[PDB]
Amino acid sequence: FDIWKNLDRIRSTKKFIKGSLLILPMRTEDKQQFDECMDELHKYIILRCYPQKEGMLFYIVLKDFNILDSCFVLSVLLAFQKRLWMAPKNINLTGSFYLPKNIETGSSIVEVGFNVVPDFQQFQVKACHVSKFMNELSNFFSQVEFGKCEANVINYFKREYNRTYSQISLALYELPLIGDGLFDIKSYISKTRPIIETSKAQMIKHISEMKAYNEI
């Protein structure tokens, strides 16, 4: 039920990473309350917050952390994201987090097959509760090891992410005009029209042959 208590719990249970990095996109439609809480986090405790502009895309990047300092933060943010919806120890966290694929690694968080994003192997988190999620996260970050990529890579990620979802915004804006203005309809019907007429003829001849093969 307490974040700092569980943080101390695997400070005691588990006995930094050279080039460590985590990117995490957040979406809170209430920009101001999210500022009121993330600034509170930074005043409590490396985790750079990068905006892009409702629909506040706030990136939280983690660099060179000792493991526990990740185990604190991510939890809070994911427990922040449900907290708006349910009732501003109970209901768990789900969400995502991203790592740069430049990794050798060697149930409750899984390598996503098919990322959209170039070169960032999306790690989704499942519906495990706070303490179990914290243990699995700490166990997994005891398992990973990175190679350096620095290149101001969030500038790359903020290009690519916004590119993908601006493109999804493009398809959503194509939603009214499907066919009728987005491609030429008259020159289209002029070639698709006798072919669909032939096909309707093929299918009615077929159903008639089925009536012959079926009856008697």
Partner: protein, 541 residues
């Protein structure tokens, strides 16, 4: 000067207007292509830099307009190559691969045949083949890719040991032209004669224990080697049997009925028996569980099927069911919202997946995007299922935000006064807009006390005082009206009876025997018979 000469030619301007009016008309854009390049010179660095920026931006808009074009990826990358700028050509094919989520073999074989000539550093160059190999090696028509890789790894290495590894890796994979590689490897078994390189064929210990050949042997070693070779040919028989059975199966069931692989132009249509083969082939590979092969085959069928919303939904329901990532399905589902011309089913399934994901802020942002996409006025769209699913998940997110307006009734279901005006404007259409009734069944299912009084007073009494003709005279409105009343927790049976005769009376009383008599009678017959007696006594008069 030929740049400005291209500008001032009227052919370019007319055709430019033709195209920029119509994005997804490919055949307009093809003439745009052909005019720009064929009207230009033989393309070298001597040509005007404005024209070269024009060709680059032209194909960039093309390629980001139709992302599944293999040949135009190759055409931009090679035309861009001929100028020079090799680093940019690497960026171009990598943009193409990133558009095919690093799959589909043609970009791979051509990038790689290109990459032989460009990149020099052997460890890295073979590492690039290796990253290629785990993505598109298992591909069924991928024989040209391997043949490239095998001839290459024969060219650069001196020890044959790295080449034997790949030969032993080929024959397990069900390729189409497997048989060239078995011929290469049978020839390779026939050439080996010094009997100590059976160690570099396969592991020494497993060559002893399973197959009974010594490598250290103090004998004449002629018949021993000949027995060794002939004994190994039995093992390659049985491997050739297994993989030949698999490939003859793949061919005879599926690839004999697939004719089109190549994504022509979202105008063009695909045969029904073709779809019939594809969905079975998708189904087939699911059972094999070799995940690289089924990622590849879903992505591979996704080329000529690209946007029919059969294969995308097939993918998403595959990943949710079997593999259980449950977020990758969101991702591909986004990527097929990104093009599938019937977006209705994919937007509903996308809604449901993300509601499972509990990314609700994504949901609310997407729904206000569908607001701004119809630019307001979602009621005025012709197809009703988009407004339908839109309206449902909008109510879900909305009444999960703002609720506890109706005391002791709670649910906040579909009854925001704003949302009321939304559903009212969908409802106040009078047959200009279709599927009007279907809202009422979800209104009529509300229930208990404050709110049957509200919804009755708000919707239905306004309907009764005005009475749009087509909207009063269907049976289903009268049906649903008596249904919403007849199912309440707040009252007895007899006031239900008094009020059902009170509701049957005021607005029909008039001809309507073709229309409200059949549905209303089946209601009346359904829930009692006694006022069906008095009902028929009314309509008879």
């Amino acid at each position: 000067d030929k740049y400005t000469a291209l500008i001032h030619d009227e052919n370019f301007s007319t055709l430019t207007l033709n195209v920029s009016r119509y994005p997804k008309s490919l055949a307009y854009w093809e003439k745009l292509l052909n005019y720009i390049v064929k009207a230009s010179a033989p393309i070298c660095k001597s040509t005007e830099p404005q024209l070269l920026k024009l060709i680059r931006c032209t194909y960039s808009s093309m390629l980001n307009e139709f992302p599944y074009l293999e040949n135009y990826y190759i055409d931009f990358a090679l035309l861009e190559y001929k100028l020079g700028n090799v680093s940019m050509s690497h960026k171009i094919f990598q943009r193409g691969l990133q558009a095919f989520n690093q799959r589909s073999l043609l970009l791979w074989t051509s990038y790689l045949k290109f990459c032989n000539n460009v990149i020099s550093h052997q460890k890295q160059l073979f590492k690039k083949y290796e990253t290629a190999e785990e993505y598109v090696g298992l591909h069924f028509f991928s024989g040209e890719f391997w043949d490239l890789y095998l001839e290459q790894i024969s060219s650069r290495c001196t020890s044959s040991k790295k080449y034997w590894n790949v030969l032993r890796k080929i024959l397990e994979i069900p390729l189409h032209s497997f048989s060239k590689f078995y011929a290469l490897w049978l020839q390779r078994i026939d050439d080996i004669m010094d009997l100590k390189q059976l160690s570099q064929l396969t592991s020494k210990d497993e060559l002893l224990k399973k197959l009974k050949i010594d490598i250290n042997y103090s004998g004449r070693k002629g018949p021993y080697l000949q027995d060794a070779k002939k004994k190994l040919k039995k093992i390659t028989k049985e491997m050739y049997m297994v993989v030949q059975y698999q490939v003859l199966e793949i061919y005879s069931i599926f690839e004999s009925k697939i004719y089109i692989n190549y994504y022509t132009s979202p105008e063009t249509l695909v045969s029904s028996d073709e779809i019939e083969t594809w969905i079975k082939y998708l189904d087939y590979t699911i059972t094999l569980q070799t995940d690289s092969l089924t990622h590849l085959n879903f992505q591979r069928a996704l080329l000529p099927l690209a946007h029919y919303d059969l294969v995308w939904i097939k993918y998403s329901k595959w990943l949710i069911n079997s593999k259980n990532d449950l977020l990758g399905a969101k991702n591909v589902l986004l990527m097929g919202l990104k093009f599938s011309l019937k977006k209705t089913e994919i937007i509903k399934l996308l809604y449901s997946v993300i509601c499972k994901l509990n990314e609700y802020v994504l949901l609310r942002n997407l729904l206000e995007k569908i607001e701004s996409s119809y630019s307001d006025n979602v009621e005025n769209v012709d197809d009703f299922e988009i407004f339908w699913d839109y309206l449902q998940f909008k109510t879900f997110c909305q009444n999960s935000l703002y609720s506890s307006r109706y005391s002791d009734s709670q649910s906040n279901g579909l009854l925001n006064k704003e949302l009321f005006d939304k559903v009212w404007k969908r409802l106040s259409c009078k047959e200009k807009k279709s599927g009007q009734e279907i809202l009422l069944n979800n209104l009529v299912q509300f229930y208990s006390k404050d709110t049957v009084e509200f919804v009755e007073k708000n919707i239905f009494q306004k309907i009764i005082e005005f009475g749009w003709e087509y909207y009063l005279q269907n049976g289903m409105f009268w049906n649903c009206y008596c249904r919403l009343i007849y199912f309440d927790t707040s009252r007895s049976y007899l006031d239900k009876r008094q009020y059902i005769v009170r509701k049957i009376w005021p607005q029909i009383d008039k001809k309507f025997a073709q229309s409200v008599l059949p549905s209303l009678t089946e209601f009346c017959e359904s829930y009692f018979p006694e006022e069906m007696d008095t009902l028929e006594e009314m309509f008879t008069e």
